[PDB]
Design a protein around this ligand. Structure first.
Ligand SMILES: *[C@H]1O[C@H](CO)[C@@H](O[C@@H]2O[C@H](CO)[C@@H](O[C@H]3O[C@H](CO)[C@@H](O)[C@H](O)[C@@H]3O)[C@H](O)[C@H]2NC(C)=O)[C@H](O)[C@H]1NC(C)=O
Ligand SMILES: *[C@@H]1O[C@H](CO)[C@@H](O[C@@H]2O[C@H](CO)[C@@H](O)[C@H](O)[C@H]2NC(C)=O)[C@H](O)[C@H]1NC(C)=O
Ligand SMILES: OC[C@H]1N[C@H](CO)[C@@H](O)[C@@H]1O
Length: 537
């Protein structure tokens, strides 16, 4: 028998209880800081939410600390909601966050470490003039929140954004200040969309063109572009554009307002929400934290007594062609790798299933690369308007085609009665150009009742003719982060097979199509647990 079969081994998550929106991430004095929305009283959202706190020297192995920001003054008596962190000149970190005041309205609060001597910033103090910012003119007291990391303009003035809506038209309210205490709403929003509802946890940063690293938020230039990100309709979206401080104007690259349609871009197309990035000036990389909600019954959450996991921190950067963003787990994860199992030049005959042996199947890192031959045989399906989620949900692992479904069977039982399939499908349009679809077929992930087993999918932007379809998977018990094409298309999935209570998990590579495919290379590593020390009291 096995207890707590769903807690992860190397993904960040508190000892117990509920967690969501990751908060004010930052790198201060050689230490990585992470904060998270926490309900110290149950395994479900509640009327009282504080800021969880934990530190790490490598984003992998953590140390849980006492909660940092909790309601102490009127400006946040009901709860301390999401916010961001900004290290101001002088090496002093500032925390701006949304609070729920006595009158139950959402406002912006400021706070900062109280004992900078302390490597772990255990104790924090609020400013006295809190709240620093209150809902604008025509804005409802529960539609104004999630302030961003601030950025300093060449003119010496700061800039931040706050989420919310104006008559149900999601917006990025922009405020400016010189001291970081007195703020004034700017005349227009930084950006916005219609009928999208409250924009949550906005994020606005610069990405260096033709590079693969990050920049300090405050950077700007002609060889730089800006990502305007926002959550809404249960998903986090973004858009690459150009920023011009002089008029606080954001001009999208594709020239579209966010729509939440299969027309826009998301970081991850599965369970991924309330994401926030931050600049790591030690390794020159922009890191991305994101909340991964549960998919099992609320009843189930109260039983296991915990909800919420954080994605494994991924590095962010704009693509070579500059039209989309790329993500990849930070190198530190590599140090968790134990033993390995390879495969090279292995054909997967039509309708076959090859098992990977010797790996720690339930907690591993698996990369696999397919070599396609005979594309002319691709099914015929113009994909200009097709919605991939519908397609993976209609054509699962058991729907045989020409090229694909071919891929990986993770968190699977020995009898394949329960399985989670991450795979591909290659299609071709009348004119002869190809398209690749990536899927996460959770339809058979678990036999348990009351579990959301919806599947997730997205189209991968590569050329099957020239490049091989690559796929890495971070398998950690109840979460699977599927990285396709080197991070050009990511998909996080939560699954809860029943077998994980008695039997051990299995790992397979498979091809259920009619056309033969070959495994160019398959590198699989068993992943050891991440160290989680506790220093609270
Ligand atoms: C991909 O290849 C097959 C594509 O159909 C798929 O077959 C599985 O087995 C049969 C078809 O041979 C079907 O199962 C039927 O019987 C079960 C009884 O256990 C019913 O519950 C099903 O609803 C259905 O009537 C399924 O179509 C299919 N899946 C299973 C095992 O139920 C293979 O499974 C696919 N390869 C893998 C392992 O992903
Ligand atoms: C401010 O932070 C420092 C650094 O952690 C604290 O100093 C440590 O205090 C413990 C006992 O509380 C000692 O065992 C360590 O030797 C101290 N280290 C240093 C660097 O002095 C200090 O106590 C904190 N002050 C407050 C306000 O609690
Ligand atoms: O826990 C409160 C936070 N949940 C939302 C995102 O899920 C944020 O807008 C809000 O600040």
């Amino acid at each position: 028998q096995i207890e707590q079969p769903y807690r992860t081994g190397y993904h960040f998550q508190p000892p117990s209880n509920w967690m969501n929106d990751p908060n004010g991430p930052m790198l201060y004095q050689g230490v990585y800081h992470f904060f998270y929305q926490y309900n110290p009283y149950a395994a479900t959202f509640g009327d009282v939410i504080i800021w969880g706190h934990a530190v790490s020297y490598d984003l992998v192995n953590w140390i849980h600390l006492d909660p940092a920001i909790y309601p102490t003054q009127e400006a946040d008596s009901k709860s301390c909601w999401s916010g961001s962190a900004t290290i101001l000149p002088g090496n002093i970190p500032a925390m701006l966050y949304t609070g729920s005041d006595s009158k139950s309205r959402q406002v912006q609060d400021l706070a900062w470490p109280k004992n900078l001597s302390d490597p772990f910033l255990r104790e924090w103090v609020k400013h006295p003039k809190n709240p620093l910012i209150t809902p604008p003119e025509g804005v409802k007291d529960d539609c104004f929140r999630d302030p961003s990391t601030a950025w300093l303009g060449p003119d010496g003035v700061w800039r931040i954004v706050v989420g919310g809506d104006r008559d149900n038209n999601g917006m990025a309210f922009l405020y400016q200040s010189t001291d970081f205490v007195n703020w004034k709403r700017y005349d227009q929003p930084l950006s916005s969309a219609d009928a999208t509802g409250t924009w949550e946890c906005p994020d606005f940063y610069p990405v260096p063109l033709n590079s693969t690293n990050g920049l300090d938020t405050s950077v700007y230039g002609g060889s730089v572009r800006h990502v305007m990100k926002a959550g809404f309709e249960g998903h986090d979206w973004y858009t690459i554009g150009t920023y011009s401080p002089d008029r606080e104007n954001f001009l999208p690259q594709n020239g579209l307002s966010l729509t939440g349609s299969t027309l826009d871009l998301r970081y991850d197309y599965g369970q991924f929400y309330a994401s926030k990035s931050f600049f790591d000036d030690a390794k020159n990389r922009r890191v991305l934290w994101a909340w991964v909600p549960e998919t099992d019954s609320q009843a189930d959450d109260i039983e296991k007594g915990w909800a919420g996991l954080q994605s494994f921190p991924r590095a962010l950067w704009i693509d070579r062609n500059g039209k989309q963003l790329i993500q990849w787990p930070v190198e530190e994860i590599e140090e968790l790798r134990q033993n390995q199992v390879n495969l090279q030049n292995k054909n997967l005959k039509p309708g076959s299933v090859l098992e990977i042996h010797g790996i720690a199947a339930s907690q591993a890192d698996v990369t696999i690369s397919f070599k396609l031959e005979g594309l002319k045989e691709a099914e015929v399906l113009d994909t200009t308007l097709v919605d991939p989620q519908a397609l993976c949900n209609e054509r699962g692992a058991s729907s045989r085609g020409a090229l694909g479904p071919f891929g990986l069977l993770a968190m699977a039982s020995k009898d394949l009665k329960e399985q989670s399939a991450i795979f591909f499908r290659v299609f071709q349009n009348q004119l002869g150009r190809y398209s690749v679809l990536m899927c996460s077929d959770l339809s058979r992930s678990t036999v348990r009742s009351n579990i959301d087993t919806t599947s997730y999918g997205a189209f991968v932007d590569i050329d099957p003719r020239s490049e091989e379809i690559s796929l890495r998977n971070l398998i950690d018990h109840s979460i699977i982060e599927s990285f396709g094409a080197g991070g050009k298309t990511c998909i996080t999935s939560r699954i809860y097979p029943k077998f994980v209570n008695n039997e051990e998990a299995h790992l397979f590579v498979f091809n259920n199509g009619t056309q033969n495919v070959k495994i160019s290379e398959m590198s699989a590593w068993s992943m050891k647990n991440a160290k989680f020390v506790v220093d609270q009291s």
